[PDB]
Amino acid sequence: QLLFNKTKSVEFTFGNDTVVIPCFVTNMEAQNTTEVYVKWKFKGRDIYTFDGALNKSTVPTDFSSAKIEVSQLLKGDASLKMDKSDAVSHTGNYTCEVTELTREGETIIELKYRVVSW
Amino acid sequence: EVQLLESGGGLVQPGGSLRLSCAASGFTFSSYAMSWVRQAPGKGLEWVSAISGSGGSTYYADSVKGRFTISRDNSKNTLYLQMNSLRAEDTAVYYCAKSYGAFDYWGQGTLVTVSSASTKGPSVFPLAPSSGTAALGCLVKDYFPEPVTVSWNSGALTSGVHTFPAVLQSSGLYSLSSVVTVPSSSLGTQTYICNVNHKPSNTKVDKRVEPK
Amino acid sequence: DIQMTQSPSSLSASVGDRVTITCRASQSISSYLNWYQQKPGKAPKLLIYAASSLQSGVPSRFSGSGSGTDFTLTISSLQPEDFATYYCQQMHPRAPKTFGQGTKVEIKRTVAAPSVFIFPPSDEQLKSGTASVVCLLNNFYPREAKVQWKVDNALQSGNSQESVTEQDSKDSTYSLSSTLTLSKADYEKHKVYACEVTHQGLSSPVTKSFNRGE
Ligand SMILES: *[C@@H]1O[C@H](CO)[C@@H](O)[C@H](O)[C@H]1NC(C)=O
Ligand SMILES: *[C@@H]1O[C@H](CO)[C@@H](O)[C@H](O)[C@H]1NC(C)=O
Ligand SMILES: *[C@@H]1O[C@H](CO)[C@@H](O)[C@H](O)[C@H]1NC(C)=O
């Protein structure tokens, strides 16, 4: 199975430029992104997919800014990036699921944001 | 070694419910997705359900969606399949399998029969050797549902054994024969016993097959 | 969803022959395809995973090739114990990981005539009220065979059922049972019970008989 360098949670404020939810596989072996599939889930919905065999990314309308850096995928980095407008409306637990042929794995990360009272 | 031990199958009336279990061992259960695959009589393999390692994601074939529920108990290393509103088309051998993709290990399979017919244990009759090589056997007649298992001399006799597929008789009960060819010289000395087991009715018969 | 088109539906090949089975995916799935061998009524066994990797423990005569949409399973030199239905399976995570239709691989061999045996009903069965007369055709090839029941020379019909085994793992032959079922009363009315066997391996039909009181 795929193993991860885990992070329980990440927090952002309006001081952050981009929201980054980390996901790092420590034992990737594929030498070509065609054999890789990445899926990020939020509240039981697929909110980002990278399908290596089609070389295609898919996001729903409520995560239009979501993406991963495909150039970092063979190193195991499947971190999700998004803008603050998408991030603030979707706080909570995200699941990063990576598949490399018969080897798969998932990890959960909580995206946190705190409303500042003044 | 890896083992996937199934239980909970059997006879169930149309519209009824069953819960299949699959006790896993020999691999880190929680690290893998698990699946259920079935095979109806005279049909191909049909993937039916899957569940991620944690249990957070479930997958179903459209043919069972809304009626079946897959679940797992990682503390007991056990996989379940709750099957509700069963129909005649759900009659199949159900297998649990490791992974959701390349199914590297499989359970033994358990027959689920959706029928209003009653369980009936079989009668076992000898097929005596009669007149260089002689044939003898056992007739396992009038049982329901399938399956029955037949062995010879508690598994010590396997060579030249032909256990025929069961045939459904006009009465709706099954019948099968298990035959073996042995040297004619051994008929007076060697003892031949057929061990018949019909788990659905708890019938266990050991029948001795002698000449005359 | 992703549909697999597996071909052929069935094939018959000799021991030592190369067996070639193909699968076409309806979408590009890179190496996300597996191959399985299934013996009748037994759990399938994984042969090839990720299109071209041999599963550990699987004999080296099995191999897989292909990537994208066109896949091939090959058995380099067929052994008699390799009779089975073989299946491809798509496993790309974008869709359900479903099986192809299957290919039944049968072992082609030379004509083998059956050895015929007959068994009267047991006294135990007769005391229970029924009579089953069993005719056994052992180790023949090809599968096509005709069994005719005759009771006191009268041709019978509608009162027998047949069952055929799968090919033997060594000699690739079949065995067949034909069971004639009569009530205890009907069985006691007749003396001669015979089963006449017609097969490609026999120059003339072979009859095996018995006399009820002996
Ligand atoms: C926000 O910025 C801080 C400081 O650079 C960083 O540690 C944190 O990971 C960022 N949060 C997110 C969700 O990107
Ligand atoms: C995959 O898609 C991206 C975005 O369209 C493109 O830049 C890249 O060249 C593609 N890779 C291949 C191998 O076609
Ligand atoms: C995220 O998961 C953690 C651990 O299960 C839990 O404590 C937390 O309440 C969850 N957060 C939300 C927003 O559901």
PDB file of all heavy atoms in Angstrom, chain B residues 39 44 95 100-103 106 126 135 162 164-165 167-168 181 207, chain C residues 34 36 38 42 44 87 89 96-97 119 124 138-139 161 163-164 175:
ATOM      1  N   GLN B  39     -21.215 -14.800  -8.837  1.00  0.00           N
ATOM      2  CA  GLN B  39     -21.316 -15.521 -10.080  1.00  0.00           C
ATOM      3  C   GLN B  39     -22.613 -16.326 -10.045  1.00  0.00           C
ATOM      4  O   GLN B  39     -22.726 -17.296  -9.290  1.00  0.00           O
ATOM      5  CB  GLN B  39     -20.132 -16.456 -10.284  1.00  0.00           C
ATOM      6  CG  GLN B  39     -20.214 -17.174 -11.618  1.00  0.00           C
ATOM      7  CD  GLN B  39     -18.875 -17.778 -11.967  1.00  0.00           C
ATOM      8  OE1 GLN B  39     -18.252 -18.471 -11.164  1.00  0.00           O
ATOM      9  NE2 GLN B  39     -18.396 -17.517 -13.167  1.00  0.00           N
ATOM     10  N   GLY B  44     -21.065 -15.059 -16.014  1.00  0.00           N
ATOM     11  CA  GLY B  44     -19.728 -14.574 -15.740  1.00  0.00           C
ATOM     12  C   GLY B  44     -19.602 -13.984 -14.347  1.00  0.00           C
ATOM     13  O   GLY B  44     -20.555 -13.993 -13.554  1.00  0.00           O
ATOM     14  N   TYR B  95     -18.353 -14.216  -3.445  1.00  0.00           N
ATOM     15  CA  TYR B  95     -16.982 -14.250  -2.987  1.00  0.00           C
ATOM     16  C   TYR B  95     -16.586 -12.917  -2.398  1.00  0.00           C
ATOM     17  O   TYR B  95     -16.867 -11.890  -2.996  1.00  0.00           O
ATOM     18  CB  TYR B  95     -16.006 -14.434  -4.178  1.00  0.00           C
ATOM     19  CG  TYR B  95     -16.199 -15.724  -4.934  1.00  0.00           C
ATOM     20  CD1 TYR B  95     -16.966 -15.768  -6.090  1.00  0.00           C
ATOM     21  CD2 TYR B  95     -15.545 -16.877  -4.548  1.00  0.00           C
ATOM     22  CE1 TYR B  95     -17.176 -16.962  -6.769  1.00  0.00           C
ATOM     23  CE2 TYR B  95     -15.780 -18.083  -5.192  1.00  0.00           C
ATOM     24  CZ  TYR B  95     -16.548 -18.113  -6.335  1.00  0.00           C
ATOM     25  OH  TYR B  95     -16.717 -19.300  -6.997  1.00  0.00           O
ATOM     26  N   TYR B 100      -9.712  -3.614  -4.226  1.00  0.00           N
ATOM     27  CA  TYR B 100     -10.749  -3.222  -5.147  1.00  0.00           C
ATOM     28  C   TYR B 100      -9.956  -2.832  -6.360  1.00  0.00           C
ATOM     29  O   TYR B 100      -9.478  -1.712  -6.459  1.00  0.00           O
ATOM     30  CB  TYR B 100     -11.679  -2.114  -4.630  1.00  0.00           C
ATOM     31  CG  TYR B 100     -12.703  -1.715  -5.673  1.00  0.00           C
ATOM     32  CD1 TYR B 100     -13.306  -2.671  -6.495  1.00  0.00           C
ATOM     33  CD2 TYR B 100     -13.066  -0.387  -5.848  1.00  0.00           C
ATOM     34  CE1 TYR B 100     -14.205  -2.303  -7.487  1.00  0.00           C
ATOM     35  CE2 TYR B 100     -13.956  -0.010  -6.847  1.00  0.00           C
ATOM     36  CZ  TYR B 100     -14.554  -0.975  -7.638  1.00  0.00           C
ATOM     37  OH  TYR B 100     -15.466  -0.608  -8.606  1.00  0.00           O
ATOM     38  N   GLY B 101      -9.691  -3.834  -7.185  1.00  0.00           N
ATOM     39  CA  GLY B 101      -8.861  -3.747  -8.380  1.00  0.00           C
ATOM     40  C   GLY B 101      -8.321  -5.129  -8.679  1.00  0.00           C
ATOM     41  O   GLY B 101      -9.098  -6.028  -9.013  1.00  0.00           O
ATOM     42  N   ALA B 102      -7.022  -5.358  -8.460  1.00  0.00           N
ATOM     43  CA  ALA B 102      -6.438  -6.695  -8.653  1.00  0.00           C
ATOM     44  C   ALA B 102      -6.749  -7.540  -7.445  1.00  0.00           C
ATOM     45  O   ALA B 102      -6.141  -7.357  -6.396  1.00  0.00           O
ATOM     46  CB  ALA B 102      -4.927  -6.620  -8.868  1.00  0.00           C
ATOM     47  N   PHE B 103      -7.726  -8.462  -7.587  1.00  0.00           N
ATOM     48  CA  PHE B 103      -8.177  -9.321  -6.501  1.00  0.00           C
ATOM     49  C   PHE B 103      -7.174 -10.465  -6.341  1.00  0.00           C
ATOM     50  O   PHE B 103      -7.261 -11.473  -7.025  1.00  0.00           O
ATOM     51  CB  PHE B 103      -9.584  -9.854  -6.829  1.00  0.00           C
ATOM     52  CG  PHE B 103     -10.606  -8.759  -7.077  1.00  0.00           C
ATOM     53  CD1 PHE B 103     -11.336  -8.725  -8.254  1.00  0.00           C
ATOM     54  CD2 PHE B 103     -10.849  -7.780  -6.120  1.00  0.00           C
ATOM     55  CE1 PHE B 103     -12.270  -7.717  -8.480  1.00  0.00           C
ATOM     56  CE2 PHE B 103     -11.812  -6.806  -6.330  1.00  0.00           C
ATOM     57  CZ  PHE B 103     -12.520  -6.776  -7.506  1.00  0.00           C
ATOM     58  N   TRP B 106      -8.944 -14.474  -2.500  1.00  0.00           N
ATOM     59  CA  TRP B 106     -10.384 -14.624  -2.542  1.00  0.00           C
ATOM     60  C   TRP B 106     -10.858 -15.564  -1.478  1.00  0.00           C
ATOM     61  O   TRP B 106     -10.152 -16.510  -1.108  1.00  0.00           O
ATOM     62  CB  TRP B 106     -10.786 -15.262  -3.888  1.00  0.00           C
ATOM     63  CG  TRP B 106     -10.526 -14.424  -5.096  1.00  0.00           C
ATOM     64  CD1 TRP B 106      -9.313 -14.115  -5.644  1.00  0.00           C
ATOM     65  CD2 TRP B 106     -11.520 -13.884  -5.977  1.00  0.00           C
ATOM     66  NE1 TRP B 106      -9.494 -13.394  -6.806  1.00  0.00           N
ATOM     67  CE2 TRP B 106     -10.845 -13.217  -7.015  1.00  0.00           C
ATOM     68  CE3 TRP B 106     -12.924 -13.895  -5.977  1.00  0.00           C
ATOM     69  CZ2 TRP B 106     -11.524 -12.617  -8.074  1.00  0.00           C
ATOM     70  CZ3 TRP B 106     -13.592 -13.242  -6.990  1.00  0.00           C
ATOM     71  CH2 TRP B 106     -12.895 -12.611  -8.022  1.00  0.00           C
ATOM     72  N   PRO B 126     -25.237 -46.861  -2.216  1.00  0.00           N
ATOM     73  CA  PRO B 126     -24.004 -47.366  -2.825  1.00  0.00           C
ATOM     74  C   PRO B 126     -24.153 -47.774  -4.295  1.00  0.00           C
ATOM     75  O   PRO B 126     -25.182 -48.273  -4.717  1.00  0.00           O
ATOM     76  CB  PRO B 126     -23.640 -48.561  -1.936  1.00  0.00           C
ATOM     77  CG  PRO B 126     -24.985 -49.080  -1.448  1.00  0.00           C
ATOM     78  CD  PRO B 126     -25.887 -47.870  -1.344  1.00  0.00           C
ATOM     79  N   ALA B 135     -15.321 -50.248 -11.518  1.00  0.00           N
ATOM     80  CA  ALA B 135     -15.878 -48.957 -11.112  1.00  0.00           C
ATOM     81  C   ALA B 135     -16.877 -49.148  -9.972  1.00  0.00           C
ATOM     82  O   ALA B 135     -17.649 -50.093  -9.983  1.00  0.00           O
ATOM     83  CB  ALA B 135     -16.573 -48.287 -12.293  1.00  0.00           C
ATOM     84  N   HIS B 162     -14.518 -39.291 -10.056  1.00  0.00           N
ATOM     85  CA  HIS B 162     -15.323 -38.393 -10.869  1.00  0.00           C
ATOM     86  C   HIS B 162     -16.598 -38.077 -10.107  1.00  0.00           C
ATOM     87  O   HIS B 162     -17.454 -38.937  -9.984  1.00  0.00           O
ATOM     88  CB  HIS B 162     -15.659 -39.039 -12.221  1.00  0.00           C
ATOM     89  CG  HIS B 162     -14.468 -39.200 -13.110  1.00  0.00           C
ATOM     90  ND1 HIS B 162     -13.601 -38.146 -13.355  1.00  0.00           N
ATOM     91  CD2 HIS B 162     -14.060 -40.273 -13.825  1.00  0.00           C
ATOM     92  CE1 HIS B 162     -12.685 -38.616 -14.184  1.00  0.00           C
ATOM     93  NE2 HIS B 162     -12.919 -39.889 -14.500  1.00  0.00           N
ATOM     94  N   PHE B 164     -19.778 -36.058 -10.304  1.00  0.00           N
ATOM     95  CA  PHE B 164     -20.529 -35.359 -11.329  1.00  0.00           C
ATOM     96  C   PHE B 164     -21.220 -34.107 -10.827  1.00  0.00           C
ATOM     97  O   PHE B 164     -21.617 -34.031  -9.656  1.00  0.00           O
ATOM     98  CB  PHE B 164     -21.564 -36.314 -11.950  1.00  0.00           C
ATOM     99  CG  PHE B 164     -20.886 -37.376 -12.770  1.00  0.00           C
ATOM    100  CD1 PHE B 164     -20.528 -38.591 -12.204  1.00  0.00           C
ATOM    101  CD2 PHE B 164     -20.581 -37.157 -14.098  1.00  0.00           C
ATOM    102  CE1 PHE B 164     -19.843 -39.542 -12.949  1.00  0.00           C
ATOM    103  CE2 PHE B 164     -19.931 -38.129 -14.843  1.00  0.00           C
ATOM    104  CZ  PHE B 164     -19.534 -39.293 -14.262  1.00  0.00           C
ATOM    105  N   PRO B 165     -21.433 -33.117 -11.712  1.00  0.00           N
ATOM    106  CA  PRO B 165     -22.222 -31.954 -11.308  1.00  0.00           C
ATOM    107  C   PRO B 165     -23.640 -32.417 -10.971  1.00  0.00           C
ATOM    108  O   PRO B 165     -24.156 -33.392 -11.570  1.00  0.00           O
ATOM    109  CB  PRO B 165     -22.226 -31.075 -12.573  1.00  0.00           C
ATOM    110  CG  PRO B 165     -21.010 -31.507 -13.323  1.00  0.00           C
ATOM    111  CD  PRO B 165     -20.975 -32.994 -13.112  1.00  0.00           C
ATOM    112  N   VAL B 167     -27.635 -32.630 -10.823  1.00  0.00           N
ATOM    113  CA  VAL B 167     -28.678 -32.348 -11.798  1.00  0.00           C
ATOM    114  C   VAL B 167     -29.936 -32.050 -11.040  1.00  0.00           C
ATOM    115  O   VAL B 167     -30.225 -32.700 -10.029  1.00  0.00           O
ATOM    116  CB  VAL B 167     -28.906 -33.435 -12.883  1.00  0.00           C
ATOM    117  CG1 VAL B 167     -27.585 -33.920 -13.471  1.00  0.00           C
ATOM    118  CG2 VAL B 167     -29.731 -34.601 -12.353  1.00  0.00           C
ATOM    119  N   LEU B 168     -30.681 -31.064 -11.511  1.00  0.00           N
ATOM    120  CA  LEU B 168     -31.940 -30.733 -10.893  1.00  0.00           C
ATOM    121  C   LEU B 168     -32.974 -31.687 -11.459  1.00  0.00           C
ATOM    122  O   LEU B 168     -33.178 -31.715 -12.676  1.00  0.00           O
ATOM    123  CB  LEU B 168     -32.313 -29.279 -11.188  1.00  0.00           C
ATOM    124  CG  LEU B 168     -33.572 -28.748 -10.492  1.00  0.00           C
ATOM    125  CD1 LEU B 168     -33.488 -28.931  -8.982  1.00  0.00           C
ATOM    126  CD2 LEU B 168     -33.745 -27.263 -10.777  1.00  0.00           C
ATOM    127  N   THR B 181     -12.723 -45.437 -10.246  1.00  0.00           N
ATOM    128  CA  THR B 181     -12.274 -46.690 -10.845  1.00  0.00           C
ATOM    129  C   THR B 181     -11.024 -47.139 -10.101  1.00  0.00           C
ATOM    130  O   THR B 181     -10.108 -46.352  -9.904  1.00  0.00           O
ATOM    131  CB  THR B 181     -12.090 -46.599 -12.362  1.00  0.00           C
ATOM    132  OG1 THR B 181     -11.110 -45.607 -12.674  1.00  0.00           O
ATOM    133  CG2 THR B 181     -13.398 -46.331 -13.091  1.00  0.00           C
ATOM    134  N   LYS B 207     -20.802 -43.765   3.751  1.00  0.00           N
ATOM    135  CA  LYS B 207     -21.363 -45.003   3.230  1.00  0.00           C
ATOM    136  C   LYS B 207     -20.276 -45.923   2.739  1.00  0.00           C
ATOM    137  O   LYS B 207     -19.444 -45.515   1.937  1.00  0.00           O
ATOM    138  CB  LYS B 207     -22.369 -44.707   2.099  1.00  0.00           C
ATOM    139  CG  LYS B 207     -23.096 -45.935   1.551  1.00  0.00           C
ATOM    140  CD  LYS B 207     -24.063 -46.540   2.570  1.00  0.00           C
ATOM    141  CE  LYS B 207     -25.114 -45.559   3.022  1.00  0.00           C
ATOM    142  NZ  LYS B 207     -26.074 -46.173   3.973  1.00  0.00           N
TER     143      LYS B 207
ATOM    144  N   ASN C  34      -6.438  -6.406 -15.315  1.00  0.00           N
ATOM    145  CA  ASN C  34      -5.943  -7.643 -14.696  1.00  0.00           C
ATOM    146  C   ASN C  34      -6.481  -8.862 -15.445  1.00  0.00           C
ATOM    147  O   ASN C  34      -7.488  -8.747 -16.122  1.00  0.00           O
ATOM    148  CB  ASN C  34      -6.382  -7.693 -13.213  1.00  0.00           C
ATOM    149  CG  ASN C  34      -5.935  -6.479 -12.458  1.00  0.00           C
ATOM    150  OD1 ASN C  34      -4.746  -6.132 -12.441  1.00  0.00           O
ATOM    151  ND2 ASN C  34      -6.871  -5.797 -11.819  1.00  0.00           N
ATOM    152  N   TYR C  36      -7.464 -13.170 -14.920  1.00  0.00           N
ATOM    153  CA  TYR C  36      -7.763 -14.205 -13.957  1.00  0.00           C
ATOM    154  C   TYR C  36      -8.026 -15.532 -14.646  1.00  0.00           C
ATOM    155  O   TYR C  36      -8.473 -15.562 -15.783  1.00  0.00           O
ATOM    156  CB  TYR C  36      -9.049 -13.838 -13.201  1.00  0.00           C
ATOM    157  CG  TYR C  36      -8.933 -12.561 -12.419  1.00  0.00           C
ATOM    158  CD1 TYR C  36      -9.229 -11.336 -13.004  1.00  0.00           C
ATOM    159  CD2 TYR C  36      -8.512 -12.570 -11.089  1.00  0.00           C
ATOM    160  CE1 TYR C  36      -9.042 -10.149 -12.315  1.00  0.00           C
ATOM    161  CE2 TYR C  36      -8.365 -11.388 -10.375  1.00  0.00           C
ATOM    162  CZ  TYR C  36      -8.638 -10.180 -10.990  1.00  0.00           C
ATOM    163  OH  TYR C  36      -8.497  -9.005 -10.297  1.00  0.00           O
ATOM    164  N   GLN C  38     -10.291 -19.010 -13.945  1.00  0.00           N
ATOM    165  CA  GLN C  38     -11.305 -19.579 -13.057  1.00  0.00           C
ATOM    166  C   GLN C  38     -11.690 -20.981 -13.445  1.00  0.00           C
ATOM    167  O   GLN C  38     -12.236 -21.179 -14.524  1.00  0.00           O
ATOM    168  CB  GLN C  38     -12.555 -18.686 -12.938  1.00  0.00           C
ATOM    169  CG  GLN C  38     -13.529 -19.265 -11.881  1.00  0.00           C
ATOM    170  CD  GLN C  38     -14.845 -18.561 -11.820  1.00  0.00           C
ATOM    171  OE1 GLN C  38     -15.372 -18.103 -12.835  1.00  0.00           O
ATOM    172  NE2 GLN C  38     -15.431 -18.515 -10.619  1.00  0.00           N
ATOM    173  N   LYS C  42     -15.135 -22.610  -8.672  1.00  0.00           N
ATOM    174  CA  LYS C  42     -14.049 -22.304  -7.727  1.00  0.00           C
ATOM    175  C   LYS C  42     -13.733 -20.822  -7.783  1.00  0.00           C
ATOM    176  O   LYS C  42     -14.015 -20.188  -8.801  1.00  0.00           O
ATOM    177  CB  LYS C  42     -12.767 -23.089  -8.051  1.00  0.00           C
ATOM    178  CG  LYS C  42     -12.964 -24.585  -8.152  1.00  0.00           C
ATOM    179  CD  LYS C  42     -13.214 -25.242  -6.803  1.00  0.00           C
ATOM    180  CE  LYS C  42     -13.273 -26.741  -6.974  1.00  0.00           C
ATOM    181  NZ  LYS C  42     -14.095 -27.387  -5.914  1.00  0.00           N
ATOM    182  N   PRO C  44     -11.807 -17.500  -8.640  1.00  0.00           N
ATOM    183  CA  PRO C  44     -10.779 -17.166  -9.636  1.00  0.00           C
ATOM    184  C   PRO C  44      -9.422 -16.942  -8.969  1.00  0.00           C
ATOM    185  O   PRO C  44      -9.315 -16.662  -7.753  1.00  0.00           O
ATOM    186  CB  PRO C  44     -11.283 -15.844 -10.231  1.00  0.00           C
ATOM    187  CG  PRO C  44     -12.784 -15.822  -9.930  1.00  0.00           C
ATOM    188  CD  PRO C  44     -12.841 -16.456  -8.555  1.00  0.00           C
ATOM    189  N   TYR C  87     -10.609 -14.511 -17.522  1.00  0.00           N
ATOM    190  CA  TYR C  87     -11.277 -13.232 -17.562  1.00  0.00           C
ATOM    191  C   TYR C  87     -10.318 -12.069 -17.524  1.00  0.00           C
ATOM    192  O   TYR C  87      -9.420 -12.071 -16.701  1.00  0.00           O
ATOM    193  CB  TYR C  87     -12.150 -13.090 -16.300  1.00  0.00           C
ATOM    194  CG  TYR C  87     -13.373 -13.991 -16.278  1.00  0.00           C
ATOM    195  CD1 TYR C  87     -13.332 -15.240 -15.666  1.00  0.00           C
ATOM    196  CD2 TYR C  87     -14.591 -13.555 -16.781  1.00  0.00           C
ATOM    197  CE1 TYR C  87     -14.471 -16.042 -15.580  1.00  0.00           C
ATOM    198  CE2 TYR C  87     -15.718 -14.375 -16.754  1.00  0.00           C
ATOM    199  CZ  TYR C  87     -15.658 -15.608 -16.133  1.00  0.00           C
ATOM    200  OH  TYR C  87     -16.770 -16.410 -16.086  1.00  0.00           O
ATOM    201  N   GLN C  89     -10.226  -7.864 -16.630  1.00  0.00           N
ATOM    202  CA  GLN C  89     -10.963  -7.013 -15.727  1.00  0.00           C
ATOM    203  C   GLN C  89     -10.363  -5.640 -15.817  1.00  0.00           C
ATOM    204  O   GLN C  89      -9.139  -5.489 -15.665  1.00  0.00           O
ATOM    205  CB  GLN C  89     -10.852  -7.556 -14.286  1.00  0.00           C
ATOM    206  CG  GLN C  89     -11.554  -6.680 -13.237  1.00  0.00           C
ATOM    207  CD  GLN C  89     -10.737  -6.478 -11.969  1.00  0.00           C
ATOM    208  OE1 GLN C  89      -9.581  -6.902 -11.862  1.00  0.00           O
ATOM    209  NE2 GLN C  89     -11.309  -5.807 -10.985  1.00  0.00           N
ATOM    210  N   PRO C  96     -16.306   1.700 -12.472  1.00  0.00           N
ATOM    211  CA  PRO C  96     -16.401   0.376 -11.814  1.00  0.00           C
ATOM    212  C   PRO C  96     -15.386  -0.633 -12.391  1.00  0.00           C
ATOM    213  O   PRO C  96     -15.155  -0.692 -13.621  1.00  0.00           O
ATOM    214  CB  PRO C  96     -17.845  -0.055 -12.114  1.00  0.00           C
ATOM    215  CG  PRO C  96     -18.604   1.284 -12.225  1.00  0.00           C
ATOM    216  CD  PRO C  96     -17.630   2.167 -12.956  1.00  0.00           C
ATOM    217  N   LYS C  97     -14.761  -1.404 -11.498  1.00  0.00           N
ATOM    218  CA  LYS C  97     -13.685  -2.324 -11.840  1.00  0.00           C
ATOM    219  C   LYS C  97     -14.228  -3.698 -12.196  1.00  0.00           C
ATOM    220  O   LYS C  97     -14.018  -4.686 -11.497  1.00  0.00           O
ATOM    221  CB  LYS C  97     -12.636  -2.336 -10.720  1.00  0.00           C
ATOM    222  CG  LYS C  97     -12.170  -0.909 -10.387  1.00  0.00           C
ATOM    223  CD  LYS C  97     -11.140  -0.831  -9.283  1.00  0.00           C
ATOM    224  CE  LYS C  97     -10.915   0.615  -8.841  1.00  0.00           C
ATOM    225  NZ  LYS C  97      -9.869   0.702  -7.788  1.00  0.00           N
ATOM    226  N   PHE C 119     -24.789 -49.846 -13.266  1.00  0.00           N
ATOM    227  CA  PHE C 119     -25.040 -50.111 -11.871  1.00  0.00           C
ATOM    228  C   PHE C 119     -26.523 -50.252 -11.651  1.00  0.00           C
ATOM    229  O   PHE C 119     -27.270 -49.294 -11.866  1.00  0.00           O
ATOM    230  CB  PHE C 119     -24.539 -48.947 -10.985  1.00  0.00           C
ATOM    231  CG  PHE C 119     -23.080 -48.598 -11.145  1.00  0.00           C
ATOM    232  CD1 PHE C 119     -22.678 -47.626 -12.044  1.00  0.00           C
ATOM    233  CD2 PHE C 119     -22.111 -49.225 -10.377  1.00  0.00           C
ATOM    234  CE1 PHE C 119     -21.334 -47.306 -12.187  1.00  0.00           C
ATOM    235  CE2 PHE C 119     -20.770 -48.893 -10.515  1.00  0.00           C
ATOM    236  CZ  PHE C 119     -20.391 -47.933 -11.412  1.00  0.00           C
ATOM    237  N   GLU C 124     -30.906 -50.989  -0.597  1.00  0.00           N
ATOM    238  CA  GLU C 124     -31.248 -49.894   0.313  1.00  0.00           C
ATOM    239  C   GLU C 124     -32.203 -48.910  -0.393  1.00  0.00           C
ATOM    240  O   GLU C 124     -33.213 -48.520   0.199  1.00  0.00           O
ATOM    241  CB  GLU C 124     -29.989 -49.119   0.749  1.00  0.00           C
ATOM    242  CG  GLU C 124     -28.916 -49.883   1.499  1.00  0.00           C
ATOM    243  CD  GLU C 124     -27.778 -48.955   1.868  1.00  0.00           C
ATOM    244  OE1 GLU C 124     -28.062 -47.807   2.282  1.00  0.00           O
ATOM    245  OE2 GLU C 124     -26.605 -49.357   1.704  1.00  0.00           O
ATOM    246  N   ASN C 138     -16.859 -43.605 -19.105  1.00  0.00           N
ATOM    247  CA  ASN C 138     -15.648 -43.089 -18.494  1.00  0.00           C
ATOM    248  C   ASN C 138     -14.533 -42.770 -19.482  1.00  0.00           C
ATOM    249  O   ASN C 138     -14.220 -43.573 -20.357  1.00  0.00           O
ATOM    250  CB  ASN C 138     -15.150 -44.090 -17.440  1.00  0.00           C
ATOM    251  CG  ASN C 138     -14.657 -43.448 -16.175  1.00  0.00           C
ATOM    252  OD1 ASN C 138     -15.224 -42.482 -15.677  1.00  0.00           O
ATOM    253  ND2 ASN C 138     -13.584 -43.965 -15.623  1.00  0.00           N
ATOM    254  N   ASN C 139     -13.946 -41.574 -19.324  1.00  0.00           N
ATOM    255  CA  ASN C 139     -12.775 -41.088 -20.033  1.00  0.00           C
ATOM    256  C   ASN C 139     -12.866 -41.134 -21.555  1.00  0.00           C
ATOM    257  O   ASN C 139     -12.080 -41.806 -22.215  1.00  0.00           O
ATOM    258  CB  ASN C 139     -11.513 -41.809 -19.535  1.00  0.00           C
ATOM    259  CG  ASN C 139     -11.461 -41.878 -18.033  1.00  0.00           C
ATOM    260  OD1 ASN C 139     -11.932 -40.975 -17.320  1.00  0.00           O
ATOM    261  ND2 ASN C 139     -10.950 -42.973 -17.519  1.00  0.00           N
ATOM    262  N   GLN C 161     -31.678 -38.690 -17.103  1.00  0.00           N
ATOM    263  CA  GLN C 161     -30.998 -37.402 -17.052  1.00  0.00           C
ATOM    264  C   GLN C 161     -29.492 -37.664 -17.096  1.00  0.00           C
ATOM    265  O   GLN C 161     -29.018 -38.653 -16.530  1.00  0.00           O
ATOM    266  CB  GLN C 161     -31.366 -36.613 -15.779  1.00  0.00           C
ATOM    267  CG  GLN C 161     -32.720 -35.931 -15.848  1.00  0.00           C
ATOM    268  CD  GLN C 161     -32.923 -35.059 -14.630  1.00  0.00           C
ATOM    269  OE1 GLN C 161     -32.889 -35.530 -13.486  1.00  0.00           O
ATOM    270  NE2 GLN C 161     -33.100 -33.765 -14.844  1.00  0.00           N
ATOM    271  N   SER C 163     -25.304 -36.182 -16.777  1.00  0.00           N
ATOM    272  CA  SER C 163     -24.416 -35.237 -16.153  1.00  0.00           C
ATOM    273  C   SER C 163     -23.039 -35.493 -16.733  1.00  0.00           C
ATOM    274  O   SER C 163     -22.678 -36.646 -16.944  1.00  0.00           O
ATOM    275  CB  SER C 163     -24.407 -35.432 -14.647  1.00  0.00           C
ATOM    276  OG  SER C 163     -23.752 -34.320 -14.083  1.00  0.00           O
ATOM    277  N   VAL C 164     -22.271 -34.431 -17.009  1.00  0.00           N
ATOM    278  CA  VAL C 164     -20.943 -34.587 -17.603  1.00  0.00           C
ATOM    279  C   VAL C 164     -19.919 -33.835 -16.760  1.00  0.00           C
ATOM    280  O   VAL C 164     -20.172 -32.698 -16.372  1.00  0.00           O
ATOM    281  CB  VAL C 164     -20.910 -34.098 -19.084  1.00  0.00           C
ATOM    282  CG1 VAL C 164     -19.630 -34.544 -19.792  1.00  0.00           C
ATOM    283  CG2 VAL C 164     -22.139 -34.557 -19.865  1.00  0.00           C
ATOM    284  N   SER C 175     -16.137 -37.578 -18.525  1.00  0.00           N
ATOM    285  CA  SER C 175     -16.867 -38.760 -18.078  1.00  0.00           C
ATOM    286  C   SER C 175     -18.327 -38.323 -17.998  1.00  0.00           C
ATOM    287  O   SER C 175     -18.611 -37.135 -17.821  1.00  0.00           O
ATOM    288  CB  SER C 175     -16.351 -39.303 -16.753  1.00  0.00           C
ATOM    289  OG  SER C 175     -15.050 -39.828 -16.957  1.00  0.00           O
TER     290      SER C 175
END
